[PDB]
Ligand binder design. Sequence first.
Ligand SMILES: CC(=O)N[C@@H]1[C@@H](O)[C@H](O[C@@H]2O[C@H](CO)[C@@H](O)[C@H](O)[C@H]2NC(C)=O)[C@@H](CO)O[C@@H]1O
Length: 129
Amino acid sequence: KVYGRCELAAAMKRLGLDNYRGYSLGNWVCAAKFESNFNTHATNRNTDGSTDYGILQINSRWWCNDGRTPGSKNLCNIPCSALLSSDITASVNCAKKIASGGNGMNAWVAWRNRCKGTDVHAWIRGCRL
Ligand SMILES: CC(=O)N[C@@H]1[C@@H](O)[C@H](O[C@@H]2O[C@H](CO)[C@@H](O)[C@H](O)[C@H]2NC(C)=O)[C@@H](CO)O[C@@H]1O
């Protein structure tokens, strides 16, 4: 599924991401935009044999098990296939675990480069939330 911007903002709000660990909702919307262009089927291979899955491009080295990544730690306790669903619940629950690490949302490289420090509140303006 390809989400609309405000469609995604609403879904993320309902799952508890606004002001999670001090990050306002627009951070998460911006991250999803630059990681996947709001496409839940997005995948990218990494050079270490792991793969990034879904709308928030969560990797199979640390976070989910895809069966083909040797030594996956599977810290989110989920198959990576669950991160490709139209329903973003599994991706959001895992994202909260990721964002609880020391470096917070810096774990998302596209957020760090294209979202961090900007007026991310723009990403939810005009949405009914
Ligand atoms: C939260 C999450 O999974 N974010 C992804 C990053 O982990 C990806 O970065 C790549 O991560 C793999 C596995 O740890 C590293 O081997 C690799 O060096 C790293 N690549 C970069 C450029 O840092 C990122 C890839 O675009 O996708 C999400 O941000």
